[PDB]
Amino acid sequence: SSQGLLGYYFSDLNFQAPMVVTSSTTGDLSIPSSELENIPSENQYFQSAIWSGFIKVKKSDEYTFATSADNHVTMWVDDQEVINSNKIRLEKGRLYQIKIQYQRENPTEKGLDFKLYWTDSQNKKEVISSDNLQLPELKQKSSNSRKKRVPDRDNDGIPDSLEVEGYTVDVKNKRTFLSPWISNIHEKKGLTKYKSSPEKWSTASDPYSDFEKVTGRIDKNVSPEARHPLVAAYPIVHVDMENIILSKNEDQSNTDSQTRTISKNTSTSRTHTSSAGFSNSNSSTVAIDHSLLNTADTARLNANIRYVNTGTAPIYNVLPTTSLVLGKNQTLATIKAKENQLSQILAPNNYYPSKNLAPIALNAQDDFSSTPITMNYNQFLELEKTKQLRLDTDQVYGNIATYNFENGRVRVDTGSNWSEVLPQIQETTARIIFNGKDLNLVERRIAAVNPSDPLETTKPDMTLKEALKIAFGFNEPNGNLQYQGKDITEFDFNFDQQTSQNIKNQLAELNATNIYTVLDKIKLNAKMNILIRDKRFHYDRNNIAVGADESVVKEAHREVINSSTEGLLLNIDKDIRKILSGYIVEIEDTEGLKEVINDRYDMLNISSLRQDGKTFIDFKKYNDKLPLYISNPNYKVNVYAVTKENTIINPSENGDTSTNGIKKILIFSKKGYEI
Ligand SMILES: [Ca+2]
Ligand SMILES: [Ca+2]
């Protein structure tokens, strides 16, 4: 189904303007006019065609060839003419390069009815079976047997003219047509316009060709958007820690004593470090939940983790090595996983192990040779004081599942490594980081011109508006670019120093003053670094959402579904719920004196997301599993939110553990008689 010959149909007489580039599984190289719907009938007359590929006999013999129009054809087997009706020998299990040309001046009908025949020695003629036909070797190199030799400079298969003018693909039966882009026909039909470098086998410089992507001849786990010739396909990996277990460690000086243990959940964001940076390292920051021995001791931690692949291509036989770090640069541990011994793939937008299996332990329960992770006394304090650890991760991703034109299958290829590709990718694409998803930093990379390197000239022009559409799924339902119903203007822009001077020089040249209104005209360059973030939120130096504007947070808590002396039951937006680290509840008597119910910095965890997706705030938790006692219907019940960034994680210098001084935000206030 994936094999057969490759065919170029031209509407002119000499293979100049190709109308269709497609493959046929058998010697039936016909295209019926009814599959030429997305070509005007002005073009459906083909004056010439070229086919190329290989034939493989399954039984040695003396074969004769012939076509449906021998008076219009010239056929070659191994650069040896055979048509212009004779005989030739073909040894078993050995491939033969075939090229067939066809020219008919002024066809009287649309499409092409053409068939390729061979006759064996027992004198049975036939349309050639599928199992005897194979595609050209459309790679950058040659395999031992398949030699590759209609301008196709990079040899991806898509002719040069089509890569430059534009082209689309239409999924016919199961077979794919590739045609020039015609404004009035495909604009109506909503088809995608494609452009790509006729000099780059792969225009984003990754492991899949511009032809492999747009025809489906590609690993099935590549993200839907990396199937675009201009959107790079690469893994991107960080480690997510989920919870942690600290312990008093076994001193060499009675091991039946009681247990001493701290077990808290954690949260891990993938980071970026700024004005965007040029770094391509993988890294994530872990925050340890802060709420409910002697100077010569040592403690040790265990934790559950999963790899996260937020890129656009799969990893198969290697997971990257990781450093668990404390403070600035004290590696406490290394985290490797055995090569070629993975229990599954790590797919894009996906975990390892998959969210349905259990996560990985750092010291597996069954594994004799896992290193105890250890801190000394002062390191432990550094950790209690920061409740933050870091996870740096290299880009060693291992081998690549590439496509094989000989058998038409996609297999892990031990000659392909990701380390041979990442550098070429990073050098020739603009990069966008966008957190519109879940306030999570997602990277993508789009082919862009480099106006100082001669090759990148032949690459397509890439506007900023287009990059957002094809790389992130922004669309414009009414001449208004948006991402899932949020207008583009709700996200801000940031750039590294160089990109920023570039874009500014561009606006000046367009005499434009506001970027949002000339996105379709801002161009991208290789090595550009663009950050893009939700305007509602405040971000730390790692570009992690750690707060919001008070008014944003108040409006968010305006929809109060219900309330009582046991709690409030609100409808808070998922994104907001993500940057609040707790709530304070107080009963304010009538003289303005305030009594705080859960008056402690480690007791603000009273929120919780009920099944239906609504939030509930538990007054009973730190009030003795009771409801609130309001001894006067005029007394007020106040409730505040604390954002992640205003949450304090230790007692103060002087030793205060109250919520006194915490920066709160009033989100609800009612009287006793209104509850
Ligand atoms: Ca080409
Ligand atoms: Ca190309």
Domain ranges of the chain: 1-233, 234-426, 427-545, 546-675
Q: Kindly give the distance from the C-alpha atom of residue 664 to the centroid of ligand 2, in angstroms, as a whole number.
A: 56
Q: Kindly give the distance from the C-alpha atom of residue 230 to the centroid of ligand 1, in angstroms, as a whole number.
A: 14
HSE value, Cβ hemisphere, 13 Å, CA-based, for 92: 3
Q: Kindly give the distance from the C-alpha atom of residue 412 to the centroid of ligand 2, in angstroms, as a whole number.
A: 23
> CATH class for domain 427-545?
alpha beta
In order of 159, 281, 447, 630, the CA distances from 277 in angstroms are: 38, 11, 19, 54
Fold held by 234-426? Jelly Rolls (2.60.120)
Single-letter code of the amino acid located at 477: P
Ligand nearest to the backbone CA of 151? 1
362, 373 contact by CB (below 8 A): yes
> Long-range contacts made by residues 19-22, C-beta under 8 angstroms, separation at least 24?
19/43, 19/44, 19/46, 19/179, 19/180, 20/46, 20/177, 20/178, 20/179, 21/157, 21/158, 21/159, 21/162, 21/177, 21/178, 21/179, 22/172, 22/175, 22/176, 22/177, 22/178
* Separation of alpha carbons 152 and 221, rounded Å: 28
HSE value, Cβ hemisphere, 13 Å, CA-based, for 324: 25
Residue 240, C-beta contacts closer than 8 angstroms, at least 6 positions apart: 268, 284, 305, 306, 307, 308, 351
Known binding residue 210? Answer is: yes
Superfamily of domain 1-233: Toxin - Anthrax Protective Antigen;domain 1 (3.90.182.10)
Known binding residue 152? Answer is: yes
Q: Kindly give the distance from the C-alpha atom of residue 415 to the centroid of ligand 2, in angstroms, as a whole number.
A: 22
As beta bridge partners, residue 95 has 56
Ligand nearest to the backbone CA of 214? 2
Q: Kindly give the distance from the C-alpha atom of residue 361 to the centroid of ligand 1, in angstroms, as a whole number.
A: 48
Ligand nearest to the backbone CA of 455? 2
Q: Kindly give the distance from the C-alpha atom of residue 457 to the centroid of ligand 1, in angstroms, as a whole number.
A: 15
Q: How many CB atoms lie within 10 A of CB 329?
A: 9
Q: Kindly give the distance from the C-alpha atom of residue 210 to the centroid of ligand 2, in angstroms, as a whole number.
A: 5
Containing H/E element for 587? strand 580-588
Q: How many CB atoms lie within 10 A of CB 478?
A: 5
Q: What is the Cα gyration radius of the chain?
A: 32
What counts of helices (H) and strands (E) characterise the chain?
9, 39
Known binding residue 163? Answer is: yes
The two structure tokens encoding residue 496: 């590294």
Known binding residue 156? Answer is: yes
Ligand nearest to the backbone CA of 152? 1
| Four-CA torsion 501, 504, 506, 510, nearest 10 degrees | -160
* Separation of alpha carbons 222 and 309, rounded Å: 12
Q: Kindly give the distance from the C-alpha atom of residue 158 to the centroid of ligand 1, in angstroms, as a whole number.
A: 5
CATH of 546-675, one of 3.40.50.300, 3.40.30.10, 3.60.70.12, 2.60.40.810: 2.60.40.810
Resolution (A): 2.8
Q: Kindly give the distance from the C-alpha atom of residue 459 to the centroid of ligand 2, in angstroms, as a whole number.
A: 9
129, 56 contact by CB (below 8 A): no
Cite the beta strand spans of 339-428 per DSSP E: 350-352, 360-361, 374-376, 388-393, 399-404, 409-417
Single-letter code of the amino acid located at 505: N
Ligand nearest to the backbone CA of 229? 2
Q: Kindly give the distance from the C-alpha atom of residue 201 to the centroid of ligand 1, in angstroms, as a whole number.
A: 7
* Separation of alpha carbons 627 and 620, rounded Å: 5
Q: Kindly give the distance from the C-alpha atom of residue 557 to the centroid of ligand 2, in angstroms, as a whole number.
A: 52
* Separation of alpha carbons 552 and 540, rounded Å: 18
Single-letter code of the amino acid located at 224: P
As beta bridge partners, residue 671 has 636
Chain position carrying tokens 């229990």: 343
* Separation of alpha carbons 537 and 556, rounded Å: 13
* Separation of alpha carbons 75 and 81, rounded Å: 6
Known binding residue 197? Answer is: yes
The two structure tokens encoding residue 624: 């003795």
Known binding residue 486? Answer is: no
* Structure method: X-ray
Q: Are 427-545 and 546-675 equal in CATH topology? A: no
Q: Helices marked H in 345-490 — which ranges?
A: 377-386, 422-427, 464-472
As beta bridge partners, residue 529 has 431
* Separation of alpha carbons 28 and 26, rounded Å: 5
Residue 645, C-beta contacts closer than 8 angstroms, at least 6 positions apart: 538, 540, 546, 547, 579
Ligand nearest to the backbone CA of 211? 2
* Separation of alpha carbons 94 and 56, rounded Å: 6
Q: Kindly give the distance from the C-alpha atom of residue 214 to the centroid of ligand 2, in angstroms, as a whole number.
A: 11
Q: Kindly give the distance from the C-alpha atom of residue 467 to the centroid of ligand 1, in angstroms, as a whole number.
A: 22
Ligand nearest to the backbone CA of 194? 2
Which among 230, 169, 226, 223 has a CA at the least distance from the CA of 195?
Answer: 230
